[PDB]
Design a protein around this motif. Sequence first.
Motif, mmCIF file in Angstrom:
data_model
loop_
_atom_site.group_PDB
_atom_site.id
_atom_site.type_symbol
_atom_site.label_atom_id
_atom_site.label_comp_id
_atom_site.label_asym_id
_atom_site.label_seq_id
_atom_site.Cartn_x
_atom_site.Cartn_y
_atom_site.Cartn_z
ATOM 1 N N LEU A 13 0.823 -1.203 0.000
ATOM 2 C CA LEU A 13 0.000 0.000 0.000
ATOM 3 C C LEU A 13 0.858 1.254 0.000
ATOM 4 O O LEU A 13 0.552 2.224 -0.706
ATOM 5 N N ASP A 14 1.941 1.242 0.779
ATOM 6 C CA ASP A 14 2.884 2.354 0.791
ATOM 7 C C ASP A 14 3.540 2.533 -0.565
ATOM 8 O O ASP A 14 3.705 3.663 -1.037
ATOM 9 N N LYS A 15 3.890 1.424 -1.216
ATOM 10 C CA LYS A 15 4.554 1.498 -2.511
ATOM 11 C C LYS A 15 3.618 2.049 -3.577
ATOM 12 O O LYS A 15 4.013 2.907 -4.379
ATOM 13 N N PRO B 43 -10.407 -1.139 6.667
ATOM 14 C CA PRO B 43 -10.067 0.021 5.843
ATOM 15 C C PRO B 43 -8.599 0.050 5.485
ATOM 16 O O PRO B 43 -7.732 -0.322 6.277
ATOM 17 N N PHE B 44 -8.327 0.505 4.266
ATOM 18 C CA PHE B 44 -6.981 0.459 3.726
ATOM 19 C C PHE B 44 -6.344 1.820 3.508
ATOM 20 O O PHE B 44 -5.127 1.875 3.306
ATOM 21 N N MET B 45 -7.102 2.910 3.567
ATOM 22 C CA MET B 45 -6.506 4.234 3.435
ATOM 23 C C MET B 45 -7.365 5.242 4.181
ATOM 24 O O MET B 45 -8.587 5.279 3.999
ATOM 25 N N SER B 46 -6.718 6.046 5.017
ATOM 26 C CA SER B 46 -7.403 6.989 5.884
ATOM 27 C C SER B 46 -7.442 8.369 5.251
ATOM 28 O O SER B 46 -6.580 8.727 4.446
HETATM 29 N N1 CYZ Z 1 -0.966 5.935 5.229
HETATM 30 S S1 CYZ Z 1 -2.379 5.306 4.416
HETATM 31 O O1 CYZ Z 1 -3.547 6.248 4.510
HETATM 32 O O2 CYZ Z 1 -2.201 5.250 2.954
HETATM 33 C C1 CYZ Z 1 -2.824 3.658 5.096
HETATM 34 C C2 CYZ Z 1 -3.935 3.543 5.873
HETATM 35 C C3 CYZ Z 1 -4.275 2.278 6.395
HETATM 36 C C4 CYZ Z 1 -3.531 1.198 6.138
HETATM 37 C C5 CYZ Z 1 -2.378 1.317 5.339
HETATM 38 C C6 CYZ Z 1 -2.041 2.547 4.829
HETATM 39 CL CL1 CYZ Z 1 -0.573 2.717 3.799
HETATM 40 N N2 CYZ Z 1 -3.972 -0.170 6.758
HETATM 41 C C7 CYZ Z 1 -4.826 -0.069 7.993
HETATM 42 C C8 CYZ Z 1 -5.212 -1.622 8.624
HETATM 43 C C9 CYZ Z 1 -4.082 -2.147 9.243
HETATM 44 C C10 CYZ Z 1 -4.391 -2.398 10.294
HETATM 45 C C11 CYZ Z 1 -4.718 -1.783 11.119
HETATM 46 C C12 CYZ Z 1 -6.029 -1.131 10.500
HETATM 47 C C13 CYZ Z 1 -5.987 -1.494 9.434
HETATM 48 C C14 CYZ Z 1 -5.564 -2.891 9.992
HETATM 49 N N3 CYZ Z 1 -6.017 0.643 7.743
HETATM 50 S S2 CYZ Z 1 -5.609 2.122 7.323
HETATM 51 O O3 CYZ Z 1 -5.379 2.887 8.521
HETATM 52 O O4 CYZ Z 1 -6.725 2.679 6.522
#
Ligand code: CYZ
Lengths: 49, 49, 49
Positions: A13-15, B43-46
Motif C-alpha cells: 500500500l505504501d509502494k 479500511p486500507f486508506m485513511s
Molecule cells: N498511510 S495510508 O492512509 O495510505 C494507510 C492507511 C491504512 C492502512 C495502510 C495505509 Cl498505507 N492499513 C490499515 C489496517 C491495518 C491495520 C490496522 C487497521 C488497518 C488494519 N487501515 S488504514 O489505517 O486505513
Amino acid sequence: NLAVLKLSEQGVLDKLKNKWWYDKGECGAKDSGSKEKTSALSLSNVAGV
Amino acid sequence: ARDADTKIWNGMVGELVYGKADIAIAPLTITLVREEVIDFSKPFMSLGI
Amino acid sequence: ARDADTKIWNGMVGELVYGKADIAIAPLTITLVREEVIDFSKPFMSLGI
Ligand SMILES: NS(=O)(=O)c1cc2c(cc1Cl)N[C@H]([C@H]1C[C@H]3C=C[C@@H]1C3)NS2(=O)=O
Ligand SMILES: NS(=O)(=O)c1cc2c(cc1Cl)N[C@H]([C@H]1C[C@H]3C=C[C@@H]1C3)NS2(=O)=O
C-alpha cells in the motif's frame, strides 16, 4: 479480509501510494521549494524611503 | 444514496445491494447507513473532510 | 503473542481464545496472525510506530 492485511503488512500500500502520489511531483512548489536565488534589488522594494 | 420513501439505493450502492455487481474496489467511504445493506473489509486508506 | 514452536497464545489474546474472557476493550493492534483466531471490529484510532 485476509488479503488487504497482507498488503498492509508488506508495505505494498505504501509502494502504490508513493507511485501514484509522490513520484508524480510535477507542479512547482514541491520541486522548487528547496532551491535558492541570491538577489537583485529593484525599485519596488525601496519606495517608501 | 437511498431514495426518500422507497429506499432505492442508486449509484454504486445499488449495484451491490440489488445483485447487479459482484465486488467494488473503488473510493467508497464506510458510513453507518452502508453497513446495513453491504459489507466492508478492514479500511486500507485513511482520510478526512 | 504466540509461543515459539508450540503456538500457545499468552497474554490477552489467549484470554479470548481459551474461553476465559468475553471481550477486550484495550490498546490492541490489528495484526495479521491475530485475525486467524479472534475477530476485530473496525478500527477506532489510527497510529504508527
Ligand atoms: N498511510 S495510508 O492512509 O495510505 C494507510 C492507511 C491504512 C492502512 C495502510 C495505509 Cl498505507 N492499513 C490499515 C489496517 C491495518 C491495520 C490496522 C487497521 C488497518 C488494519 N487501515 S488504514 O489505517 O486505513
Ligand atoms: N484520528 S483517529 O486515529 O483517532 C480515528 C481513527 C478512526 C476513526 C476515528 C478516529 Cl478519531 N473511525 C474510523 C471508521 C469510521 C468510519 C469511517 C472509517 C472508519 C469508519 N476508523 S479509524 O480510521 O481507525
